């Protein structure tokens, strides 16, 4: 076959002016869609703590107006899914990613509505769920809109503007082009044969995507967390330990993720009125928690900052590691839209801060800030439960511009998903996709 | 050039206590460790403590609750050591170091001329 | 802790001619550091994590070592060369360095 090679090797990179074009404005649709759901899961957030305000002096109706107001939009959250699109439950990684499979329906009249409205709901309640899942899928189905909008017909437009869609969705949920990008090349791509997705096309639509993103957001950095320390080689093999532990510890989550899914059946059957009513529970938990107990709720980005510092006692840190681990499974195995990337970076953080600690204390010698080891354990989960870890680390570099700390964060990484491998783990995508397209059989 | 510049030392009175001060020069003196070590006359060299760039972690040598007080001020440049109940064991040549590594094993990268603290009533 | 204990303390040789002193220490101890200390002048670091020269150390200079004996040496001794020669260990916490060893020209 050496001759069609010569002929291929010729031909490379010859991406259609039209899925370029298109790539583009998928970008700029998916990034303005971005910031519309950023500013409104704000706004909502905004509402709920200055309701807190009007009544701050009776504790009790403090309780029940946090509990109600998060229960209320959980409700109408989990119902707008349960009624009009119950694909866009959960996290919409696993449905978009099926997708590039032919192997799962694009229904967008259906999951923009529903998913960017119903996440608002749950986000905005301060349940523990992300923006990066949501705005993946979100942006996935804005790509195939205007597949179909511009009826482009080819193998070619329908994997690309779905990949553009889905790539520009999680670079505009983070500010983080590069991560982006190299989560279509890495984790959502058709895992198991060739396919036609154009890298040039996601190029130009993360490009604008992201630009939408600057234009609304300025000046503001989702996590700072200043310069860190370096790390010195004679360091290096603390992180391949910590990275070992969460090897471990990620696929240990990963059944409890799915066992939870199917606890939580279990207790409203399908029916969408105790679902409705079993989500405004967890939500208005969430609400209450929210005020009572911050670190225990919420989407996590907050303490990530605080964490890496090392301004959290080791017992707090245990304590918030623990809870966010109850309170993230509540809410994303409950089914609600909203996902489990985010609320893993800071699982993460806080494992790794803890870690960081006794580090510190049992070698002096290596001058340790227990801050370089939450930031080599940020990414871990994400190497350990979802197996993406060329993603997370680079998604990881580009929210903390710590790069000194590479080594360590690869490091880590590998440990991390060589130990999620060697202890009988898999994908975690990769694994509700199966799980729901053997049921979509049964 | 990178200059480390000790003084404060001189002649204290049994008992009491002095406040050196090493003023860094040359080189982002954030980002580095500093560090203090001594020289009693005709004797050896001896560690004192050291401090890490943000102050959130000192450490001394083996030696008494509040003996010693290393310090530093980012923002003058400067790092500070505080020795109280001054006994004669203290009269040394004190030394100021900025600290650094190679394969991750720390030295005692660049050192000042000294300042001397004879303790005599 | 670590007590790093320098051979010769005292020794002289002349110049263009092979000097050799020797630290040791009472426990197992890792890449040990130099510093070439004359009177009057602030320490400077010689030799590091066991056998790096600095910037300016000149070639004649080489340390060695392993476990618990190190080692410093001048494959031709200068008169520039005069001074003291302290080793130091951080491999454990806290650090120690070693008495000294003074190395006087001969004439």
């Known amino acids: 076959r050496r001759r069609q090679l010569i002929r291929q090797l010729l031909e490379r990179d010859k991406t259609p002016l039209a899925i370029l074009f298109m790539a583009a404005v998928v970008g700029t649709l998916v990034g303005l869609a971005a910031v519309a759901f950023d500013k409104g899961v704000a706004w909502l957030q905004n509402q709920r703590m200055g309701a807190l305000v009007h009544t701050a002096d009776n504790y009790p109706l403090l309780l029940t107006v946090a509990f109600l107001c998060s229960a209320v939009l959980a409700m109408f959250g989990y119902f707008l899914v349960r009624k009009y699109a119950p694909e866009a439950g959960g996290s919409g990684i696993p449905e978009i990613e099926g997708a590039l499979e032919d192997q799962r329906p694009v229904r967008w009249w259906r999951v923009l509505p529903v998913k960017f409205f119903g996440g608002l709901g749950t986000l905005g309640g301060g349940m523990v769920l992300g923006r990066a899942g949501p705005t993946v899928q979100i942006g996935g189905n804005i790509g195939r809109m205007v597949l179909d909008i511009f009826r482009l017909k080819g193998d070619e437009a329908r994997h690309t503007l779905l990949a553009t869609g889905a790539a520009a969705g999680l670079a505009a949920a983070f500010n983080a082009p590069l991560a982006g990008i190299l989560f279509i090349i890495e984790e959502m791509r058709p895992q198991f044969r060739y396919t036609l997705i154009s890298i040039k096309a996601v190029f130009i639509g993360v490009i604008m995507s992201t630009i939408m993103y600057r234009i609304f957001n300025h000046e503001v950095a989702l996590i700072d967390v200043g310069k860190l320390s370096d790390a010195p080689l004679n360091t290096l093999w603390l992180y391949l330990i910590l990275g070992i532990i969460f090897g471990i510890f990620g696929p240990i989550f990963n059944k409890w993720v799915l066992g939870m899914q199917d606890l939580l059946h279990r207790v409203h059957g399908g029916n969408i009125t105790k679902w409705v009513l079993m989500g405004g529970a967890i939500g208005g938990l969430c609400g209450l928690l929210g005020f009572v107990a911050p670190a225990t709720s919420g989407g996590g980005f907050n303490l990530i900052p605080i964490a890496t510092a090392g301004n959290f006692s080791m017992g707090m840190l245990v304590f918030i590691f623990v809870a966010r681990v109850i309170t993230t499974l509540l809410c994303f195995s409950s089914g609600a839209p909203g996902g489990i990337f985010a609320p893993m970076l800071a699982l993460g953080t806080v494992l790794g801060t803890a870690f960081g600690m006794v580090a510190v204390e049992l070698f002096p010698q290596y001058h340790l800030e227990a801050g370089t080891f939450a930031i080599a354990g940020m990414g871990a989960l994400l190497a350990a439960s979802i197996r993406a870890p060329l993603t997370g680390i680079i998604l990881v570099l580009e929210m903390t511009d710590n790069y000194q700390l590479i080594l360590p964060m690869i490091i880590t990484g590998l440990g991390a998903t060589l130990l999620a491998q060697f202890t009988g783990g898999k994908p975690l995508y990769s694994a509700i996709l199966a799980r729901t397209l053997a049921k979509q059989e049964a | 050039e990178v200059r480390l510049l000790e003084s404060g030392g001189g002649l204290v009175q049994p008992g009491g206590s002095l406040k050196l001060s090493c003023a860094a020069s040359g080189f982002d003196y954030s980002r580095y460790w500093m560090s203090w070590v001594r020289q009693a006359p005709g004797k050896g060299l001896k560690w004192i403590g050291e401090?890490?760039?943000?102050?959130?972690?000192?450490n001394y040598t083996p030696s008494l609750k509040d003996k010693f007080i290393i310090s530093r001020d980012n923002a003058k440049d400067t790092l500070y050591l505080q020795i109280s109940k001054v006994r004669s064991e203290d009269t040394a040549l004190y030394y100021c170091?900025?600290?650094?590594?190679?394969?991750?094993?720390?030295?005692?990268?660049?050192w000042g001329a000294g300042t001397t603290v004879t303790v005599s009533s | 802790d670590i007590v790093l204990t320098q051979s010769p303390a005292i020794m002289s040789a002349a110049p263009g001619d092979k000097v050799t002193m020797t630290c040791s220490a009472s426990?197992?101890?890792?890449?040990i550091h130099w510093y070439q200390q004359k009177s009057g002048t602030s320490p400077k670091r010689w030799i590091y994590d066991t056998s790096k020269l600095t910037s300016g150390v000149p070639v004649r200079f080489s340390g060695s070592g392993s476990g618990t004996s190190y080692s410093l040496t001048i494959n031709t001794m200068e008169a520039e060369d005069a001074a003291t020669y302290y080793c130091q260990q951080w491999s454990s916490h806290p650090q120690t360095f070693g008495g000294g060893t003074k190395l006087e020209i001969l004439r």
């Open positions: 170091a900025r600290l650094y590594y190679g394969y991750g094993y720390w030295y005692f990268d660049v």
């Open positions: 426990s197992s101890v890792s890449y």
């Open positions: 401090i890490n760039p943000v102050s959130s972690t000192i």
